Design a protein around this ligand. Sequence first.
Ligand SMILES: CC[C@H]1COC(c2ccc(OCCCCCCCc3cc(C)no3)cc2)=N1
Ligand SMILES: CC[C@H]1COC(c2ccc(OCCCCCCCc3cc(C)no3)cc2)=N1
Lengths: 59, 236, 59, 255, 40, 40, 40, 273, 273, 57
Amino acid sequence: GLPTTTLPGSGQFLTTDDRQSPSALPNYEPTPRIHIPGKVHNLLEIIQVDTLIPMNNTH
Amino acid sequence: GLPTTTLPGSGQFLTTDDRQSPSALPNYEPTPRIHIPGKVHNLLEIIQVDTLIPMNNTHTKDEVNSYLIPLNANRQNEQVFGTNLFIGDGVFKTTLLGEIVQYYTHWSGSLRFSLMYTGPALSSAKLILAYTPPGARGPQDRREAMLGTHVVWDIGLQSTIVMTIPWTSGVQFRYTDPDTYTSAGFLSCWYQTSLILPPETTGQVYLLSFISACPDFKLRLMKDTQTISQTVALTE
Amino acid sequence: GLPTTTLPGSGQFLTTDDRQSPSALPNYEPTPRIHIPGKVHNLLEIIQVDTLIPMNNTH
Amino acid sequence: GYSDRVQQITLGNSTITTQEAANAVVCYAEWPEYLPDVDASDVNKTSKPDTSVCRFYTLDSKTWTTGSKGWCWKLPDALKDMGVFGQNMFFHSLGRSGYTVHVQCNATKFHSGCLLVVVIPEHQLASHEGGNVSVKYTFTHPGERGIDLSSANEVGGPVKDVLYNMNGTLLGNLLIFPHQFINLRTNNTATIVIPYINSVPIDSMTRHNNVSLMVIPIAPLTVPTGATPSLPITVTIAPMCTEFSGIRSKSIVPQ
Amino acid sequence: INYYKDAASTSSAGQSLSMDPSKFTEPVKDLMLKGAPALN
Amino acid sequence: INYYKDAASTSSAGQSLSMDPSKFTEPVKDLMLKGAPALN
Amino acid sequence: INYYKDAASTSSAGQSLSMDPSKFTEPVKDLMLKGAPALN
Amino acid sequence: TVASISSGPKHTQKVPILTANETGATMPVLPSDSIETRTTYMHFNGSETDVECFLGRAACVHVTEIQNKDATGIDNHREAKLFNDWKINLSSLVQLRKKLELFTYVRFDSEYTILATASQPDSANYSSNLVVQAMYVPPGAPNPKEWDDYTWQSASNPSVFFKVGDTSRFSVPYVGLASAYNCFYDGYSHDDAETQYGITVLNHMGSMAFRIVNEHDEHKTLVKIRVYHRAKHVEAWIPRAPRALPYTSIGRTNYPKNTEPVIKKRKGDIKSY
Amino acid sequence: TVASISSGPKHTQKVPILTANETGATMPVLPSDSIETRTTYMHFNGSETDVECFLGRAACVHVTEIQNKDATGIDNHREAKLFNDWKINLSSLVQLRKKLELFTYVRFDSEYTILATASQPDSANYSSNLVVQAMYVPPGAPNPKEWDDYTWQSASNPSVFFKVGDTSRFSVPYVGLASAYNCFYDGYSHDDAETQYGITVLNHMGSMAFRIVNEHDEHKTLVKIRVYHRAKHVEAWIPRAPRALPYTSIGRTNYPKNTEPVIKKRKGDIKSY
Amino acid sequence: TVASISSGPKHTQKVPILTANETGATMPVLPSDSIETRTTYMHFNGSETDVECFLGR
Ligand SMILES: CC[C@H]1COC(c2ccc(OCCCCCCCc3cc(C)no3)cc2)=N1
Ligand SMILES: CC[C@H]1COC(c2ccc(OCCCCCCCc3cc(C)no3)cc2)=N1
């Protein structure tokens, strides 16, 4: 038995933390990926495509 | 599953502990630093800059005048000012030195006390500043004063005189909040000869006095300052 | 997140255990030691000095 | 035969000579310099009028009398109307600058008096009303006139109490800011070089002042017998390494 | 260190650091050079 | 050992051990030597 | 393994294993040999 | 390191103790320039006066309170403390404020600890176990309106759920818009004749609104939230004079009128000890 | 290691058993100087008599008590035990005191454990869960005044928050002003004719004041605090005679008048067994 | 990485700002194609806009 101390924050759930978890479906094999045109990696990729501005807002 | 045991103290929150925490904002990129003159790294850097001491504390409401130590022409043998050296209280207390010392419990080191003369250029004066180490009373006359640490100051072209209160102590640390066992002495100043004004001139002349710490100085065991408090939370 | 199990005795306070603790005064510098004659290391050092016995206990 | 005492500063088309100086202070030991690329953000090339803006402007003179409490000027405000410096100021969106400040006050070897000349980076003033009353714009933009600490409280203006630096701190501790004394017996001028100090690389010159220059009598003026009881104090200031960026239409500011 | 056997149980992935907007911003068949005329 | 990915999540920094009061105590333009006259 | 930065936070010290009673049991100025007469 | 060197009698033309303070310098004079000293060592590093250490311990920055009670018929949850928000800021509670305002610009990461304890001031059979959900409502994001709005879904906004009686802890990077946070700002948000002055317009960061996730039990439960803040990775520029008068407002320098003399008057003369 | 060597008959001019105790020495005489012995080994190191071991286990040094109750209309929180402080010290509770005073000067780091348990002596529906906040009020720092003063912000003063029923543990470096703590001090704080004498003027360190963070429930709850202290990294100088009479005061050597004979009288003669 | 390069006056036959949006492209025009710029660096990677980050809380 190794001695430990727990710190403030133990047991909290922070929606933004990133840790490991047990898989509920041990050993399951996902469907293979096939190729699909159009993959997005960054939202910065798409905000460089121009779109129309409803400038004439007066309606 | 690795076997563990939790010790006493688990779950406590100690405001002074230093550990890692998850970031709430994963992957966020802070603004770049640009250069800004003036970076401070240690409070020890700043307590070496001297600031004015309201030595003339005798007023009744805070005034620019309690920074001015007056001098009288033609007095001989007499005493210009006196103070004990409880740097955390009394005259010292509002100075930057006094103000920082109050964030710590213990101090040790030498102090630098200087006086800048502001009288007409055609006047002259010789003063004696004396440091009295712990153990004797505040000196009562120059004879008594002159037997301890002292500097005869001759007022000249060079306007300021820097007296050092060298660390004289049995115990290597003193308390910043005034304590007896731990007390540091007295500082007094007397006419050595006397102030003399030129013709066509009259009245009082004043000395400005500063305090800063020597590079010698140590402060330790941080705590809360008696210099600030509040009764309800502030709002916008 | 690494999986753990806590054993019997968790949370107990044993006045005789010897472990690490956080310092309440982070970074504080203690007064230097100076030399003092007389250091004791073991109680076995001192019980070898003889002392008087109130043998005449009859008072 | 160089003395700490005599000095000449030539900047642009203007020169100052002092024969009774007491060295010069360079804030935080740094000398004004232009904005490096590594620190840049705005993509605009900046404009550096050089000698037409980096010369010495002498503000109107003040009069130290035995009752004076002290005066306060803000930068770049104090210069908002000086020559082309000022025009550039109202015409660009952003600008940046360092300064040489030269405060002048001469008397004779029978006078006494001592002024503190200090530069305070980001001097946020307090309302004399207390609470959370704000200090209106006009009040913190006195222009070349500066603020006269012995003038009366006004409404929407700052507090003018000297033992508190106009902000809740004691006069005695102003010495932690770059400063120099003018002690009639020693000194006759004070000179401070101010590098640009901000938390952003360049800023607006009209909505934010980045230093207040403050001249405060501390040992009262004492003139020789039957002398006139007052001396003028003059402040001359020169922008140095000035850069303007984001030119356009020309700001319109309150009052 | 993964403590678990399955890949789904590992933490979040790490930045694509891929980034290529041209499939979205310039899907034209004949290449357009900036500075050259759009329509020749 | 950092257990977390972001730098903000690490513990306190470690002593500057920088320390140079001269920007505050001696910001004069012409260097003053202790022992030499202040004003020449 | 120390988990903490300060020395006060470490566990108990480890045995002096110093042990020298002579400062207490034989602080005499001229050395006494067992077996030789106490007072000569 | 030597704290003092050995120095003996002096009869020179070289006087280190005469200076001209008008210059603005504090000449580095030592005991050995004016008395005869002996060698002594420092034995000390100045570790605990590092600014990281000075600003690096948790300080209480905010105490708020919310209650768990039947919201049935409450027209204004916010007003019933069915939840609350804190227009985040640090200069509210002051112990820490005076410490930070020793500097003009400050840059650091924050570590927050949130302690929540419950009170049941009037007759309850028991103490219930409530889960708090504090969430970060940065500015531009919508404000909840009820204690159970879509807002609380918080799909893009970091939120932490912990139990009353426990503590929550997480750390946020330096979120300032500029290179440092301004402890002071002698400016306006624009050249308006009536706009506010000071830092309240700069050091913007929206708020952090707390709520209990639990529905109501038969009694009412008061939960009081205390937020602690610890600076880590500190960087501070341009020291200033310490605060002397009391504070009146978050973000302005203003002091109260008819305040009291802050310098202690002597009981005696200038000459007194 | 041999505990005894083998030694046989002796008929010498060299007598190790005759000495002169007037000299102040304890001559190192052994069984083998006066009887015939056989070899035997020690099999032992003297591990558990090391001073680190002797002073190194936790001892109870203080029991105090505070209560959680409605402070409404209380004119003196301190007096209602709405919180309390302990003018920190170690010679109060004695088991540990006699142990330390076997030495004149002692130097060590302290490890504190604080156990807090609650009592509800009069009718309660339940047991509430209270968080204690003990904080270090070193001397010069201000004293709280109410159980919820600005003091408790403790922005610069180390404080720990733990739950009643749990334990808190942290360790403080050796905070003495000198090189060691004086277990005894035959002096005064100054040459005053009426100043106090002893160690109470030396071993100064201000206090540690506890409070409950929780507001009040409908019943009252008594929380009793026990502070345990363990010396780690011990260094002790100059052994002294053990304490024989009972103690009367923290910090003075004084014993009670008409105390009882401390040496057990024989039931019989000097000659008795 | 540079966010903007330095660029000065232009008087060309090569106009990067005239395009034909009918083509469906968004031509990659920059500040330096139409005003005079100074060098500046990005100081930023676009970390927190990665889709793993966007959908990962
Ligand atoms: C005291 C004078 C000036 C100086 O600094 C400041 C100051 C003011 C505000 C400030 O903001 C801190 C950032 C807060 C944002 C953290 C996110 C909160 C949160 C909750 C959850 C869940 N996740 O994140 C940081 C510094 N004001
Ligand atoms: C028994 C005879 C003499 C010998 O030693 C002593 C003696 C007396 C007092 C003493 O002080 C121990 C230090 C206490 C300070 C620790 C800080 C407490 C604290 C609370 C929190 C939260 N963080 O820290 C240490 C030793 N008296």
